[PDB]
Design a protein around this ligand. Structure first.
Ligand SMILES: CCCCCCCCCCCCC/C=C/[C@H](O)[C@H](N)CO
Ligand SMILES: CCCCCCCCCCCCC/C=C/[C@H](O)[C@H](N)CO
Ligand SMILES: *[C@@H]1O[C@H](CO)[C@@H](O)[C@H](O)[C@H]1NC(C)=O
Ligand SMILES: *[C@@H]1O[C@H](CO)[C@@H](O)[C@H](O)[C@H]1NC(C)=O
Ligand SMILES: *[C@@H]1O[C@H](CO)[C@@H](O)[C@H](O)[C@H]1NC(C)=O
Lengths: 272, 48, 44, 246, 293, 246, 272, 44
C-alpha cells in the first residue's frame, strides 16, 4: 500500500443488534471500530504516503557513537587509542535502538578527526579494527600495526572523512540489547551480580588508531564515530525508556527521584 | 503513550485517532457516561 | 535514476534496496484465536 | 446480539450494554417531505451533518420523593448549536427525532421509569376557578421549559387531566433497573400540517415519571442522574429571514 | 532602585553608554533632527529630553533606549542594559533549554498573556515564583534552582507580550522571572524594607478592588515611608494608612493630594487600605517603606 | 438583447436597462469542492436556497471629493441573515460570489468608476517608522470594515503600496455614466486551501474608486448613491460547533 | 507555439457595418482589434521565440536571500548563528516574487562563506537546518549539534560552496505572500494589529551554523544564502509594487513622501 | 545532449524538465460570458 487508507461513505442507523462501539478491552485485542460504523463520514481518497515511516527510512541516520581521544605526548605518551565498539555510550541512538529486542543490520562507520584547537594539518592516520580474539597493539611502534591479515584504513587529516561498510558478524542470528541470563555457568552471588545481562554476542572487537610517523607529533586529536544503519530488520518491539540512563551496559535507574512520564497539571477537570 | 512518542519522533501527523475507555468498577454498579469530542475553536466547554 | 548498481563483489556494501510496503498490523492489534467480528459483541 | 446496540448519527455514537429493543413510533420512519404533501414553493435546506446529531441535555438527580419531569422537544433545541441557530433564522420546520434516556444503577437498587412521548402535550392550569380573569393558566416557563425542563405537580394526571395509567397507548418504553438502563424511541414527524414554526409550536414532548419509587439500603450510592440525548433526524428548514429568539 | 515600572518608563539615570562592558556611546537628544524623537519636538520633559545623551524611553517601549551612531549596517538604535533598572519583584531573565525547566510546575499558554495574568495564575495556586517566555507562556514553580541554565542579558529578553504591548514577556528560549507577591491583594509583610504594589500593578487596577496590607516588625522603633510612583486620575479611589491598635486613621491620600516623599511615624503595626472605584482607573502605587531598629 | 439582463438567485432578482457584459473571473465557474481536492472527512451542509441569494448592503453618497471605498467579502456577510448565522456556527467555509454595483445618473452627469476584486487584499499601514513598536498597523475596523465599509486615504496606491494603474490585471469592470449604470462580476472560490474559516480570513475584497471625478452643472441632482448587492453562490459549511462572533 | 504570431495579408475596406476599432472598454475585457482589421499589412512569417518569457526560465535565478554573521569571539562569544528562512529580507527577489499571489516551487540553496578581511582558510563549518518545532542549538558545544534525525552539511572554507535541493514542504497546497486574515481566533485590538497578515504556512524553520573545533577560532565569518527557484508554478498574478519597502513581513509604505509611478514632464502637449 | 537523467531516488532534486509552451491568454483578456465577435459592436 502506497497510501494510508480511504474512507467509505457512511450514514445513520436506527436498528437493534449491531454494537460496533462496545469493543471489549479485557480480551487483550485492540478496538477495531472504524469511523464508518459511527458518525456519518464522506468519501475521501487519501493519497498520503507511508514510505517515510518504514524501518529502513527510520534507521538510516548516522548519529554520534564514539569519541576517541589521542594525545600522543612526549613524556606521558601512549601512541595508540583503542575504542570498544558499543552503541550504548550516547543515549540518542541508544534510545532509538532499544525500542526493539532483536535487530540485524549493517554499518556505514564514518570517522571525523579534528585537532584540539581545530585545524586540518596533513597528518596521516591509521585506523585499525581489531577483531575479538586478536592481540591489541601496545605502542605507536608495535608489531601489530603491520596489518597483515587485518583490515586498516590509511587517511590524512586534510582528506575527507573515511567511510567503510561493515557486515553482520554476530555469531547468533541477530543482535540483542536485552539479555535475560548469565554468560557462563556456576554459582551466582547475591551481593553484586556484575555479569547479569552481559551478552557475548555483541563484543565486536576493538578499534585502534595511531599517528604514522617516526619520532612523535605533539598534537591531541579527537576522533568521532558516526555509524549509519542499513539493511536493518527488527523483531519483538519494546517500549521506549522513560528514565534517564545511568550506565552503559546496564539499564539502571534512580530508585528515589523518579521522573514521571507526563508532566503535572492544575486539575484533572481542566484541559489546559 | 507509544503513539505520543512516535509522533514525537516526527514533526507532522495526520489521520484519525482512537481513545478507548474502560470501566474497572464493580459488577453491580451501573451508570451512563458522555464522552464528547469538540473541534477546535473556543476553550473547554463549561457545561454539558 | 539508478541506485541499484553495486560496485563490489560483496552485497552488504550496497545502498538501500527496493522498499517493502508490507504492513501486517493484526499480529499486534488482534492476537486472538476467535476472530471477533466488526459488528458484534466481543463476549457473549 | 440484541442487548447491545451502537447508534451512530453524524459524529456522535451511543454504545449500550443493557438495552431492550428499539421503539419505532407508529411503525413509520422519519423521512423527507414528498412533493405531493408539500405546500411551500421555496426550496428547503438540508444540512444532514450539522443538525442531525446527538445533543445531550443536562442530568437530573432521581431522588426518592421525585414526581417526574417533562420537555417540549422542538423548543429544547431551539438555542443549542447549529440546529437552534438554523431554526431561529427559518420560519418553517419539519423533522423527526431519535431519543435515548440514560439511567444506570447497581444490582442492589430497585425502581422503574415510564418514558413516553405525547403528541400535542398541552399543559393544563391547576385550580377550581371558572371566572375568565382568575382562571389559572401555566406560564411560559411551564409550557415551554427550555433546555432545563419542568417538574410535575400532579403526575398521576400527567398535569393535563388525563390519567397516567391510560398513557400506555403512546409510544413508550420502560426503564426497569433490574432489566435495562436505557430506553430508545424513534418518532417521526407527526402533525396535521406539512411544515410548522419550531418556536411557537411544540409537536410532542418527552415525559419521565418514576412509577416504582427508588429504593436502596443504607450504604449504596445515592446520586442517580437522569440523562437524555436527542438526535433531530431528517431535518428541513424553509423561509429564511431574520433570526428571532422567541 | 531606579525603575519602578515594568518597562523603565521613568528612569532618570546618568547612563550615556549602551553597555558598561562592550558598548558603544549614545547620541545626544538634541542632535537627532533626522529621527522623530528629539528636543526640537518635545520641550519641557516629555519622558526626559534635555541636552544629554541618556538612555530614556519616550515612545513607551519595553526598555530604555538611546540613539547609536549608524555605521551603514542597519541598526541605528540599541537597548541600554542598565544594571540598576529593575522593579523590586523582577529577578531577571534566564535561559531555557528543554524538558527539565528552570521552573518545575504548572504551565499555561494564552493569546492574551500579560505580566499580571501570569502572576495571578501562579498566585492562585500558591506558587512562589512566576515566569514567562516568548510572549505566550506562564511557568509556575517553587524550586530555588532557577538559574540552572545561566543568566541572560536584560536587553535579550525584550519580546513584547500578546495581551499588552508595553511589557517584556521574556523571549524566544529566554524566561523572565517574577515573584507572585507583586500586585497581590494584601499580605502579612515582615521584611525589613520591601515594596507594596497596587492590585494589578503591571496592568491598570481593576474595578472594585479592596484589600488590607499589614506590616509588622518584631521590635522596630519607628517606620519610614516613601512614595516613588503615584498616578491617580480620580478623587473617589484613595489610599489610607491605619494603625490597628485602637483602629484610627493616620493619613488619607487621594488623586487630588500630593503625598510627601518621606516621613517618620512612631508605630509598628501599620496597615494599608486601598478602596478603588468603578469609574476611572489609570495606574497604581509603588509604596516603599523602611523600618529602623 | 445584450444590454438587458435579469439575474435570479434564490428569491431575489436584479433587472437592468444599461448593462455591459457580465464578467466571469478567470474563466472559471464557482462549483462545489470535488472529492479529489477535499481534505475534511465530515459531510458539509448545502442550504442552496437560504444562503444563496442577493444581499443588499447600504448605499454611500458619491461626492465630488471622494477617494473610494473597499470591503472584505467573507467578512461583510458575517452577521447578516441565515448566511452569517450559518457561518458563525461552522469552522470551514467555501463559496463563490456574484456581485452587482448600482450607480445611476442622468445624461448630464459625467464620471467613471473602477470596480474590481483583489484576492488577498492586504491593508498596509501608513507611516515612515521602522521601529517595531511604533510601526503603524491598521486597526481591526480598517482591516475588516464589516457591513459598513472603509474609505481610502491614498487611493492612488490602493492603500497597499501597489499602484492603481496596474490594478487592471484583476477581474474588473468600469461604470461609465454615459455607457452603463451597473457592473457585474462573478468570482469563484480562490484560495490555496480547500476550506477556510470565514471569520479570521477574507479571501478577496471589492474596491470602488472614482477615476474620473463626478461633475455636473448647477441645477441637477446632487445625491449619487453607490449600492452593492452580493450573492454567495455555491456555499458549503463544515465543522459544526458553538457560534462565535469574531 | 514555438514562435510568436504570423501576420495575414490585409487590404482596404469600403463598406458599412463592420467596426473593429470600436472595442468597448466598459465591459472589462481587452481590445481584440488586430492589425489585419486595420491599416493594410503584409505576410510576415515570424520565427521569434517565446521560450525565454516562460515562468520556469524567469524564476531560474539565484539572487541574494540571507546574510548571516558569525563572530565566534573569545569573551563575547555565542558560537552559533541562526537565520530565520524568509525571502522578504532583500527587495530584488521579493519584488520579483510578490507579483503573484500563490506560488509553489523547489529550492537550490547555496552557501558562500567568506572571512572579515576575506580569506579561505581550511576551517570546516557545519550548516544545520532546524525544522519548525525542533529545538534550536544554544552554544557551539550543544547537544543539538549531533544531527541525529536532522539534516546537516559539513564543508570547509577552501571547498566549493555547498548546494542542496529543498522540496515543497508547506502544509498548505501552495505558498502565499499576502494573507488577508489573522492566524488565530480571539478579540483583535484597534491600537496595534501586529499579527495581521501573518501566515503560519510560511515559517520554514531556522538555519544555524557553527565552527567545528574544540576551543575557539578568532574569526568573523559572513555567510550568504543564494536560493534558486525551480519547478515553479504561480497563480493569480498581482501588480508590481511601486513604493519602497519599509519592513520585512509587512508591505508598509510612506503616507507622506509618496513616489509617483512615472516621472514628471515639461508639459502634457510635449513628447520629449 | 541529455539533462533528463536524475541521480537520486527523489524527483525534486532534478533540473528543469521539458518546457511547456501552453499560453492561455483569454482567461485574462476576455473574461466575459457573451463571446464578443471581432467584427461587431461590443454593445447593442
Ligand atoms: C576499519 C575500521 C572499522 C571500524 C568499525 C569496526 C567494524 C566492526 C563494527 C561492527 C558493527 C557492530 C555494531 C554494534 C554491535 C553491538 O551491538 C554493540 N557492540 C553493542 O551495543
Ligand atoms: C541543510 C541546510 C539547508 C538550508 C535551507 C533550509 C531548507 C528549507 C528551505 C525551505 C524553502 C522555503 C522557501 C521560502 C519559504 C517561505 O515562503 C518564506 N519563509 C517566507 O518568505
Ligand atoms: C558620560 O557622562 C560622563 C559624566 O560624568 C562624562 O564624564 C563622560 O565623558 C560621558 N561619556 C560619553 C560617551 O558621553
Ligand atoms: C546639545 O547639547 C549639548 C550639551 O549642552 C551641547 O554640547 C551641544 O552643542 C548641543 N547640540 C546642539 C545641536 O545644540
Ligand atoms: C523621620 O525620622 C528619621 C530619623 O530616623 C529622619 O531621618 C527623617 O528625616 C524624619 N522624617 C522627616 C520628614 O523629618
Amino acid at each position: 500500500a502506497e497510501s494510508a487508507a480511504n474512507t467509505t461513505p457512511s450514514s445513520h442507523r436506527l436498528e437493534t443488534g449491531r454494537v460496533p462501539a462496545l469493543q471489549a478491552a479485557e480480551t487483550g485485542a485492540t478496538s477495531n471500530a472504524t469511523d464508518e460504523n459511527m458518525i456519518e463520514t464522506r468519501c475521501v481518497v487519501n493519497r498520503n504516503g507511508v514510505l517515510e515511516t518504514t524501518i529502513n527510512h527510520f534507521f538510516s541516520r548516522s548519529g554520534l557513537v564514539g569519541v576517541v581521544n589521542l594525545t600522543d605526548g612526549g613524556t606521558d605518551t601512549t601512541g595508540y587509542a583503542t575504542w570498544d565498539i558499543d552503541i550504548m555510550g550516547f543515549v540518542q541512538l541508544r534510545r532509538k535502538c532499544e525500542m526493539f529486542t532483536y535487530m540485524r543490520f549493517n554499518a556505514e562507520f564514518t570517522f571525523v578527526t579534528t585537532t584540539k584547537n581545530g585545524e586540518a594539518r596533513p597528518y596521516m592516520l591509521q585506523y585499525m579494527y581489531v577483531p575479538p580474539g586478536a592481540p591489541k597493539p601496545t605502542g605507536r611502534d608495535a608489531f601489530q600495526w603491520q596489518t597483515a591479515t587485518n583490515p586498516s584504513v590509511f587517511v590524512k587529516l586534510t582528506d575527507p572523512p573515511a567511510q567503510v561498510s561493515v557486515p553482520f558478524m554476530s555469531p547468533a542470528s541477530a543482535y540483542q540489547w536485552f539479555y535475560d541470563g548469565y554468560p557462563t555457568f556456576g554459582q551466582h552471588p547475591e551481593t553484586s551480580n556484575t555479569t547479569y545481562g552481559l551478552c557475548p554476542n555483541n563484543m565486536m572487537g576493538t578499534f585502534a588508531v595511531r599517528v604514522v610517523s617516526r619520532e612523535a607529533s605533539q598534537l591531541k586529536l579527537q576522533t568521532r564515530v558516526y555509524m549509519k544503519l542499513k539493511h536493518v530488520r527488527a523483531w519483538v518491539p519494546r517500549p521506549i525508556r522513560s528514565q534517564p540512563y545511568l550506565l552503559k551496559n546496564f539499564p539502571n535507574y534512580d530508585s528515589s527521584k523518579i521522573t514521571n512520564s507526563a508532566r503535572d497539571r492544575s486539575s484533572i477537570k481542566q484541559a489546559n | 503513550t507509544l503513539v505520543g512518542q512516535i509522533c514525537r519522533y516526527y514533526t507532522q501527523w495526520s489521520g484519525s485517532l482512537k481513545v478507548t475507555f474502560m470501566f474497572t468498577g464493580s459488577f453491580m454498579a451501573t451508570g451512563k457516561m458522555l464522552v464528547a469530542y469538540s473541534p477546535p475553536g473556543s476553550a473547554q466547554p463549561a457545561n454539558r | 535514476n539508478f541506485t541499484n548498481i553495486n560496485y563490489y563483489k560483496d552485497s552488504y556494501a550496497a545502498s538501500a534496496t527496493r522498499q517493502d510496503f508490507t504492513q501486517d498490523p493484526k499480529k499486534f492489534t488482534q492476537p486472538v484465536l476467535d476472530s471477533i467480528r466488526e459488528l458484534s459483541a466481543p463476549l457473549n | 446480539s440484541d442487548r447491545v446496540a451502537q447508534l451512530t448519527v453524524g459524529n456522535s455514537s451511543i454504545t449500550t450494554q443493557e438495552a431492550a429493543n428499539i421503539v419505532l413510533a407508529y411503525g413509520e420512519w422519519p423521512e423527507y417531505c414528498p412533493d405531493t404533501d408539500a405546500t411551500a414553493v421555496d426550496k428547503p435546506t438540508r444540512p444532514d451533518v450539522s443538525v442531525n446529531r446527538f445533543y445531550t441535555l443536562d442530568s437530573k438527580m432521581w431522588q426518592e420523593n421525585s414526581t417526574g419531569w417533562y420537555w417540549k422537544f422542538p423548543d429544547v433545541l431551539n438555542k443549542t448549536g447549529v440546529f437552534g441557530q438554523n431554526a431561529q433564522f427559518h420560519y418553517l420546520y419539519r423533522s423527526g427525532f431519535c431519543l435515548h434516556v440514560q439511567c444506570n444503577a447497581s444490582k442492589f437498587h430497585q425502581g422503574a421509569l415510564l418514558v413516553a412521548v405525547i403528541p400535542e402535550f398541552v399543559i393544563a392550569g391547576r385550580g377550581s376557578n371558572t371566572k375568565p380573569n382568575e382562571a389559572p393558566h401555566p406560564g411560559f416557563t411551564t409550557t415551554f421549559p427550555g433546555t432545563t425542563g419542568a417538574t410535575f405537580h400532579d403526575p398521576y394526571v400527567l398535569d393535563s387531566g388525563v390519567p397516567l395509567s391510560q398513557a400506555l397507548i403512546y409510544p413508550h418504553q420502560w426503564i426497569n433497573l433490574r432489566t435495562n438502563n436505557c430506553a430508545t424511541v424513534i418518532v417521526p414527524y407527526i402533525n396535521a400540517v406539512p411544515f410548522d414554526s419550531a418556536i411557537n409550536h411544540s409537536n410532542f414532548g418527552l415525559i419521565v415519571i418514576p412509577v416504582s419509587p427508588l429504593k436502596y439500603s443504607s450504604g449504596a450510592t445515592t446520586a442517580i442522574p437522569i440523562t437524555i440525548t436527542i438526535a433531530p433526524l431528517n431535518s428541513e428548514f424553509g423561509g429564511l429571514r431574520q433570526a428571532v429568539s422567541q | 532602585p531606579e525603575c519602578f515600572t515594568a518597562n523603565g518608563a521613568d528612569y532618570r539615570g546618568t547612563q550615556n553608554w549602551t553597555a558598561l562592558q562592550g558598548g558603544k556611546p549614545c547620541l545626544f537628544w538634541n542632535e537627532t533632527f533626522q529621527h522623530p524623537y528629539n528636543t526640537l519636538k518635545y520641550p519641557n520633559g516629555e519622558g526626559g529630553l534635555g541636552e544629554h545623551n541618556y538612555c530614556r524611553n519616550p515612545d513607551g517601549d519595553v526598555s530604555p533606549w538611546c540613539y547609536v551612531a549608524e555605521h551603514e549596517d542597519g541598526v541605528y538604535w540599541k537597548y541600554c542594559e542598565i544594571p540598576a533598572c529593575q522593579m523590586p519583584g523582577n529577578l531577571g531573565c534566564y535561559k531555557d533549554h528543554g524538558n527539565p525547566p528552570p521552573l518545575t510546575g504548572t504551565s499555561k499558554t494564552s493569546n492574551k498573556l500579560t505580566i499580571q495574568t501570569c502572576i495571578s495564575f501562579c498566585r492562585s495556586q500558591r506558587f512562589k515564583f512566576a515566569g514567562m517566555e516568548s510572549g505566550y507562556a506562564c511557568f509556575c514553580g517553587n524550586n530555588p534552582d532557577y538559574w540552572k541554565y545561566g543568566e541572560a542579558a536584560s536587553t535579550e529578553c525584550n519580546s513584547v507580550c500578546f495581551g499588552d504591548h508595553t511589557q517584556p514577556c521574556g523571549g524566544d528560549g529566554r524566561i523572565i522571572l517574577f515573584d507572585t507577591l507583586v500586585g497581590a491583594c494584601g499580605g502579612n509583610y515582615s521584611a525589613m524594607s520591601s515594596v507594596v504594589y497596587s492590585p494589578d500593578f503591571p496592568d491598570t487596577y481593576a474595578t472594585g478592588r479592596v484589600c488590607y496590607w499589614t506590616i509588622r516588625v518584631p521590635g522596630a522603633s519607628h517606620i519610614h515611608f516613601s512614595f516613588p510612583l503615584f498616578d491617580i486620575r480620580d478623587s473617589a479611589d484613595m489610599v489610607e494608612l491605619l494603625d490597628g491598635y485602637t483602629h484610627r486613621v493616620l493619613a488619607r491620600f487621594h488623586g487630588r493630594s500630593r503625598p510627601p516623599l518621606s516621613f517618620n511615624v512612631s508605630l509598628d503595626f501599620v496597615i494599608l487600605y486601598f478602596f478603588s472605584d468603578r469609574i476611572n482607573q489609570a495606574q497604581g502605587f509603588a509604596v516603599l517603606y523602611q523600618a529602623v531598629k
